Amino acid sequence: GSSGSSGIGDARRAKVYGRGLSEGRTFEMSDFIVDTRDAGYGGISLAVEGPSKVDIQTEDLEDGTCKVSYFPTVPGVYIVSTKFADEHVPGSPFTVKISGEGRVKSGPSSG
How many of the other CB atoms lie within 10 Å of CB of 101? Predict the structure, then answer.
């Protein structure tokens, strides 16, 4: 059997990359990958604190990593509390600045 002895890891080893870790936008599904296979084992705690409540969907991928997904409804600063085995990843918390309407640019050049 696979399950057995405790394989606790180290957050410092856990890696996080994607789009919902740096920037983001309102009413836009922003998820990211969480590399834990390189760290080891342990319980992962996720908590987003922003200007409003946002759903959080997680799932175990084939690679062994976890992909978090959320849907912001209000623009502001969403604090993504990423923890692993009772240890915050090397760089947390994750301050994700969400931008509302007003695309980066519309078209200052006719055509």
Answer: 8
